[PDB]
């Protein structure tokens, strides 16, 4: 690694990242996912989001640091995962992606993976 960014918080570990990124991609294929900052910021304003994933090592980090303060008002969990390049892949994109918002459909197929991971994430926010 490199010095993990002090502002990065909650930071998911190795074992949670595998469980999270796997859900991301699993949602990508049902197109319940939304990738990128602005696409994610849109979600919260509307009110459809489930949780946000962000890149920890996003350079500079200040460009996404607004999401946390928005999430806390809409009561939406969030975490950082350790690299952007990995998050890029899971969304089905060649290229680096710093944020992503899974959305809501309560008829969904993957519904029970999501509640699983939010339950894990909200633990990190102590």
């Amino acid at each position: 690694m490199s010095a993990p960014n002090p502002k990065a918080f909650p930071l998911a570990d190795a074992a949670l990242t595998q469980q999270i990124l796997d859900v991301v991609q699993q949602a990508a294929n049902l197109r319940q996912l939304k990738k990128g900052a602005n696409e994610a910021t849109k979600t919260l304003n509307r009110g459809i989001s489930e949780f946000i994933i962000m890149a920890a090592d996003c350079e500079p980090i200040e460009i996404l640091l607004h999401l946390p303060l928005l999430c806390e008002d809409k009561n939406v969990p969030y975490v950082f995962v350790p690299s952007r390049v990995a998050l890029g892949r899971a969304c089905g994109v060649s290229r680096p992606v710093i944020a992503a918002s899974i959305t809501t459909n309560d008829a969904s197929a993957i519904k029970t993976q999501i509640y699983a991971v939010k339950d894990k994430i909200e633990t990190l926010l102590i």
Binding site: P6, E72, D73, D119, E122, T123, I126
Partner: protein, 429 residues
């Protein structure tokens, strides 16, 4: 015969297919080379035969060679702090002596019948408790609430890190609010004596000494404390009264004076975050909980790590000392409360209450009465009541709709105040 074999050999598929059979066949054997060769150990979906081919495809392109060639100090300084340790010893030693004597005196009477009635009464009292009101504070969850030594006023810290002081009995509305310079509040604590001061730690790595003025909303900064890089999770006043100890994230719990606002001790020893610091009632010892799941005792006077406690397989959020002073209690991400009494040492050690599901934030003993009950808060939305003798769970109370960051209990034990992700402050009977 040569030209027939050469053209076949020159061909890429064939060139690969020859290489595939010289590479070992097991999941582990194949895998190890990959990680050593730095390429991804595993891909999306694949059976091992597909995995094996990838090796070859990688081995072919780079023209890389075969798996054959592939494979403690004593720190001096700070005499001035040294002076303090003496003070602590004089204060500590006397206090401990008094405490032990007092404990002994209790022992003599026995007359079990009275006591065993008392516990029953206490449990019944605990069973009854209910909400009085809710209330509001902000739109961020409430990270810390604390009651003054007279139990008339509560301070509430938001994640937004603004503190409003409320009136114990009624709560309505409040006295007056202040939006402090800091954004995300760790903990808030009262000086044991005057009821004129508080202290608050937060995300910015700066601790603020507040003067609470009379019935005025003119809460006044007495001074700021510097030295901390990361967010500060917990802060406490020595039982004495002179010293404040701070414990943050960068593996440094720092012992601070109130008056001079100086760094008396910079301590090290955990390997990740340190999420709580507790001071134990004779003012002899501080126990540090950490994110590395190691509860580590410390002797302030010698500056010697004493007894390391291992029990928590997730981060240890709260470390609650007991009034008696011979027991400690911890809580953690793992949904366990450990209670270690140091006297036994050889074979008594830790009694685990299995308390809560979904973490534990703040465990609290009952202040008066030497400590008997435990009260704790997790994200399970419930709130618990424990004996300190059996550590049987007695009762639970649900009035919160959301998770609970922290809770403090009335000195008499006629209040319980709990604050919550849901943004209210709920007074329990």
């Amino acid at each position: 015969n040569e030209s027939t074999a050469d053209i076949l050999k020159q061909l890429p598929h064939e060139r690969l297919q020859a290489v595939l059979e010289k590479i070992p066949e097991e999941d582990l054997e194949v895998r190890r080379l990959l990680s050593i060769l730095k390429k991804p150990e595993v891909v999306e979906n694949e059976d091992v035969q597909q995995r094996r081919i990838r090796l070859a495809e990688i081995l072919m392109v780079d023209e890389i060679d075969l798996e054959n060639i592939n494979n403690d100090f004593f720190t001096p300084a700070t005499s001035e702090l040294i002076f303090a340790r003496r003070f602590l010893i004089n204060y500590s030693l006397e206090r401990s002596r008094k405490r032990l004597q007092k404990e002994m005196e209790r022992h003599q009477k026995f007359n079990t019948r009275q006591e065993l009635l008392s516990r029953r009464t206490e449990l019944q009292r605990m069973a009854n408790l209910e909400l009085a009101g809710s209330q509001l504070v902000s739109t961020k969850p409430i990270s810390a609430v604390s009651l003054s030594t007279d139990d008339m006023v509560v301070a509430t810290g938001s994640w937004a890190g603004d503190l409003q002081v409320l009136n114990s009995q009624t709560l309505q509305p409040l006295t007056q609010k202040l939006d402090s310079h800091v954004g995300k509040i760790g903990a808030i604590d009262w000086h044991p004596d005057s009821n004129n001061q508080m202290i608050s730690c937060a995300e910015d790595g700066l601790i603020k000494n507040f003067q609470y003025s009379n019935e005025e909303g003119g809460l006044r900064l007495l001074g700021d404390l510097v030295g901390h890089e990361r967010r500060i999770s917990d802060v406490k006043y020595h039982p004495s009264g002179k010293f404040i100890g701070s414990a943050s994230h960068d593996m440094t719990w720092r012992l601070w004076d109130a008056s001079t606002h100086q760094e008396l001790l910079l301590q090290e020893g955990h390997d990740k975050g340190v999420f709580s610091l507790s001071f134990q009632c004779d003012g002899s010892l501080v126990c540090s909980g950490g994110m590395d799941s190691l509860s580590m005792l410390w002797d302030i006077r010698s500056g010697s790590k004493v007894m390391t406690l291992a029990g928590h397989s997730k981060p240890i959020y709260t470390v609650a000392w007991s009034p008696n002073g011979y027991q400690v209690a911890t809580g953690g991400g793992d949904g366990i409360i450990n209670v270690w009494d140091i006297r036994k040492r050889d074979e008594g050690q830790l009694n685990q209450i299995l308390a809560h599901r979904n973490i534990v934030t703040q465990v609290r003993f009952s202040k008066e009465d030497g400590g008997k009950k435990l009260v704790s808060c997790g994200y399970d939305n419930l709130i618990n009541v424990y004996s300190s003798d059996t550590w049987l769970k007695m009762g639970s109370l649900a009035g919160h709709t959301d998770k609970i960051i922290s809770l403090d209990i009335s000195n008499n034990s006629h209040f319980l105040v709990s604050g919550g992700w849901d943004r209210s402050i709920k007074l329990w009977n």
